[PDB]
Design a protein around this nucleic acid. Structure first.
Ligand SMILES: [Mg+2]
Lengths: 532, 380
DNA sequence: GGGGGCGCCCGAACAGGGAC
DNA sequence: GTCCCTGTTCGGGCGCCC
């Protein structure tokens, strides 16, 4: 192929590989053909370099060390084309190039490093892009791009989705003219040395493309088969999760969180039976026939989110009701402590950034949160936070802050002065309080931290107080967490605190500087630091 | 023209920053713009054999913007007057930088990738053949020319000051409303710094004080003791002896009542003894005050504020982005450096949207803060 | 016993602030 | 500094694509 070569070097101070090794009769079969067609060349013992080979009718070379010594490349594949980004076309063809890499010449000054040797119980060089070499994918994609350009310029109103060596070509032409143009594209590729085998030329729907089934008006995924094991290794769940993540692009309401959390510090894992539920529910959903549609720029893009439960979210992007382009999910646990409004913000961000990639614009949102709640949270939150143009959609469970913190102290309510102290060598602590109505309490903790004792202190106060309470704390830490109004935490203690907060009618929390001989903060400190 | 050889710094390679997702209109615009820079020889197509990348985008006429922040950190290494003049104007003089070829040995470091809607196509990579708009070394190379280009204007008008920051040229004059505006125009053919007021610290004034009110007072004053040495909380703290309810009313003593007046006294003057060090890093901290109001302080060592202020005005992202540029602008005019910001926003929230509001030539460095709900109480 | 990309999840390693 | 804790990036497993 008349493609000009891409110049490639090793890294400045390094040398080629020198590694050494009955699939041998399989390998001589292949290599002899490859030489006949010029893909390789035999070399003599003068060439110092060698890299291992193996076969699995298919030959591949382990170029790990070569790759390590090869220059860095800027990868030109920035993502995966998605079906929901496809515009509706009258005529469509899917195409594949055969022997992609091997139709593309390597850098003559570099070929000597690709040296390999079929073993004894014959040495070669690569003349084209080897498979397993680090630079081949980028060099192919870049080359395919430059090869396709003259045709792209010539046929500006023909869409070619170009993924490695796979080609989707769509046009607004009638099936005859279109087939002519495909042929012209096929001839163009041959002149540049690229074969498109008829055996991989798809001329009628459904088109198999990029994992999908492309019909004329709708698209879908190719069948998904979940692994149904008796025992579950850590990997089987990772496999199962990934398969479920892939399904969630078009099957609505896929859930992964509970399956997900079974992997922590982790061999076989008992399915927590919260997991087998969501699995079983998932299995039910994959019995559903679902489909997506194609993209119309003359319409609005609309995302719509719902809460699946426990920081688990589902969305749908559509232009017309009941016909959604794509679906998806969000279930990331970001932060040690969080709440539903935070996560909805995060869900909005994921969808936004996903839409920019697929459609080149941001959707209009439909969210299950009242304009009020949002403005309330946006008020009480100290760091910047935002959501684009959105409608409220009455679709339970709505999104809410589960408790609120008073802005002013509660008159008459008991005032707790809480504090905690921990010794770093012994890891022994004390948490407790001193109140206006005369009450006093100190508990001791084993195996704790100073930040933990301050959380205990506050927890103490909420257990012992009545439905209303003012708390004064000298802890920047604890106040930071609680003023953010979490409803979920990694911390059991913060969770316990949360159940309490939900129960109060009113909580007011206030901060004071430590060690300034101030209020009962000195009193409770002395009780609590004693022994620490 | 002679190209001036440039290098990076010892033990440091070129930028390798991934391109980020772009709106269709920004891509469309960029692709339109890039072609003619290619057609005119200012940039030439490259491939993956070039291992470097710097992000690109477009702000709106569109204007190509290249985030050369990483390259700027990696490339080899001021009028007090401008800060003083009643009217200062800002010009876009980047296009000048294209008139100077760049050391071909260095061009590989200027590489960028145009992205593609729905990944229809791999990225299309380009390199710079001339001094790139927005790069640190561009002003350094084009300065000897620049001095020459406008010296007539400078000697024709000695009471007009001109300062250059990257693609930006700051031109300041004391002339009246309309004649500032017209001696600008013969520069294009060839914002006032003294309206910037320090935002003081203020204490609440009220007729009756509760335990809570005092606690909040003693907390704020305690913190202010770091910036202001003289401040005292001694008399106030003792009003809080014993464990009182928060709503209780506390009559102020004689001694506390004017310890407060004396505390109000200190905060009533300017902070002393803070001097800008060009060698040291310049920091800006921003806080959200609600109200559509934002407080900021610029400093080099903690509590040594070169300046404090307030940006006031709802879109939290847009407002913070707008605060960042207003603050940055100021810091150039006054010191000729941009500061590393500490931003009260989650990284991903900010990264999602800040480029839809940016309208400047430069980009400051920033990191993100997990901020105290406290320092909000300190600048009210 | 091979390569490149994107996504999702984890723990590990590191940065940074508060409190000693 | 330390410890603690919270945040982020990184690398590895899986998914999918070629
Ligand atoms: Mg204490």
């Amino acid at each position: 192929s008349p493609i000009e070569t891409v110049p490639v070097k090793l890294k400045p101070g390094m040398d080629g590989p020198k590694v050494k090794q009955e699939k041998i009769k399989a390998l001589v079969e292949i290599c002899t053909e490859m030489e006949k067609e010029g893909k390789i060349s035999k070399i003599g013992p003068e060439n110092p370099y060698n890299t291992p080979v193996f076969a699995i009718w298919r030959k591949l070379v382990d170029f790990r060390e070569l790759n390590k010594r090869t220059q860095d490349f800027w990868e030109v594949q920035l993502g995966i084309p998605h079906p929901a980004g496809l515009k509706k076309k009258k005529s469509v063809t899917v195409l594949d190039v055969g022997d992609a890499y091997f139709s593309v010449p390597l850098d003559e000054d570099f070929r000597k490093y690709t040296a390999f040797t079929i073993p004894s119980i014959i040495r070669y060089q690569y003349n084209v892009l080897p498979q397993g070499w680090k630079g081949s994918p980028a060099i192919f994609q870049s080359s395919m791009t430059k090869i396709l350009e003259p045709f792209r310029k010539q046929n500006p109103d023909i869409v070619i989705y170009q993924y490695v060596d796979d080609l989707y070509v769509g046009s607004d032409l009638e099936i005859g003219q279109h087939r002519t143009k495909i042929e012209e594209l096929r001839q163009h590729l041959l002149r540049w040395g690229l074969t498109t085998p008829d055996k991989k030329h798809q001329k009628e729907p459904p088109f198999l493309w990029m994992g999908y089934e492309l019909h004329p008006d709708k698209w879908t995924v190719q069948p998904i088969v979940l692994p149904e094991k008796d025992s579950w290794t850590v990997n089987d769940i990772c496999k199962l999760v990934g398969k479920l993540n892939w399904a969630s692009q078009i099957y609505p309401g896929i859930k992964v969180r509970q399956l997900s959390k079974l992997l922590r510090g982790t061999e076989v894992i008992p399915l927590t039976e919260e997991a087998e539920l969501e699995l079983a529910e998932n299995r039910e959903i994959l019995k559903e026939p679902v489909h997506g549609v194609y993209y119309d720029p003359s319409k609005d893009l609309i995302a719509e989110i719902q809460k699946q439960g426990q920081g688990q979210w589902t969305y749908q992007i559509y232009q017309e009701p009941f016909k959604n382009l794509k679906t998806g999910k969000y279930a990331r646990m970001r932060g040690a402590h969080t709440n539903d409004v935070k996560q909805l913000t995060e869900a909005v961000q994921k969808i936004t950034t996903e839409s920019i990639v697929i459609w080149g614009k941001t959707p209009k949102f439909k969210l299950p949160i009242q304009k009020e709640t949002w403005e309330t949270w946006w008020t009480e939150y100290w760091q910047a936070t935002w959501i684009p143009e959105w409608e409220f959609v009455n679709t339970p469970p709505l999104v809410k802050l589960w408790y609120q913190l008073e802005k002013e102290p509660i008159v008459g309510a008991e005032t707790f002065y809480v504090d905690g102290a921990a010794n770093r060598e012994t890891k022994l602590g004390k948490a407790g309080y001193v109140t206006n109505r005369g009450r006093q309490k100190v508990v001791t903790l084993t195996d704790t931290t100073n930040q933990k004792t301050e959380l205990q202190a506050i927890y103490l106060a909420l257990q012992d107080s009545g439905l209303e309470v003012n708390i004064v704390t000298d802890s920047q830490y604890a106040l930071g967490i609680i003023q953010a109004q979490p409803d979920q935490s990694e911390s059991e203690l913060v969770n316990q605190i949360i159940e309490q907060l939900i129960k109060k009618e009113k909580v007011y929390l206030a901060w004071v500087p430590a060690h300034k001989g101030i209020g009962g903060n000195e009193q409770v400190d002395k009780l609590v630091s004693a022994g620490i | 023209i002679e190209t001036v050889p440039v290098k990076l710094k010892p033990g440091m390679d070129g930028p390798k920053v991934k391109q980020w997702p772009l709106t269709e209109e920004k891509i469309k615009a960029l692709v339109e713009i890039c072609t003619e820079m290619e057609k005119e020889g200012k940039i030439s197509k490259i491939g993956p054999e070039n291992p470097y990348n710097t992000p690109v985008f477009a702000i709106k006429k569109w204007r190509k913007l290249v985030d050369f922040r990483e390259l700027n950190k990696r490339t080899q290494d001021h009028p007090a007057g401008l800060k003083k003049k009643k009217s200062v104007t800002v010009l876009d003089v980047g296009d000048a930088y294209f008139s100077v070829p760049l050391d071909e040995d260095f061009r590989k470091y200027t590489a960028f990738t145009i992205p593609s809607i729905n990944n229809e196509t791999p990225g299309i990579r380009y390199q710079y053949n001339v001094l790139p708009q927005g790069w640190k070394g561009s002003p350094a190379i084009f300065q000897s020319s620049m001095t020459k280009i406008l010296e007539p204007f400078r000697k024709q008008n000695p009471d007009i000051v001109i300062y250059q920051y990257v693609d930006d040229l700051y031109v300041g004059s004391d002339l009246e409303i309309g004649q500032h505006r017209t001696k600008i125009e013969e520069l294009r053919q060839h914002l006032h710094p003294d309206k910037w007021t320090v935002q003081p610290i203020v204490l609440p004034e009220k007729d009756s004080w509760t335990v809570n009110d005092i606690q909040k007072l003693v907390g704020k004053l305690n913190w202010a003791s770091q910036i202001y040495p003289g401040i005292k909380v001694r008399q106030l703290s003792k009003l809080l002896r014993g464990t009182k309810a928060l709503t209780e009313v506390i009559p102020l003593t004689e001694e506390a009542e004017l310890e407060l007046a004396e505390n109000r006294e200190i905060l009533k003057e300017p902070v002393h003894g803070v001097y800008y060090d060009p060698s040291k890093d310049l920091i800006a901290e921003i806080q959200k005050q609600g109200q559509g109001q934002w407080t900021y302080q610029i400093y080099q060592e903690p509590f040594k504020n070169l300046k404090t202020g307030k940006y006031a005005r709802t879109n939290d992202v847009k407002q913070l982005t707008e605060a960042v540029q207003k603050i940055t602008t100021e810091s150039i005019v006054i010191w000729g450096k941009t500061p590393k910001f500490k931003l009260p926003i989650q990284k991903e929230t900010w990264e999602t949207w800040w480029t839809e509001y940016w309208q400047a030539t430069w980009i400051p460095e920033w990191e993100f803060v997990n901020t105290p709900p406290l320092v909000k109480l300190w600048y009210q």
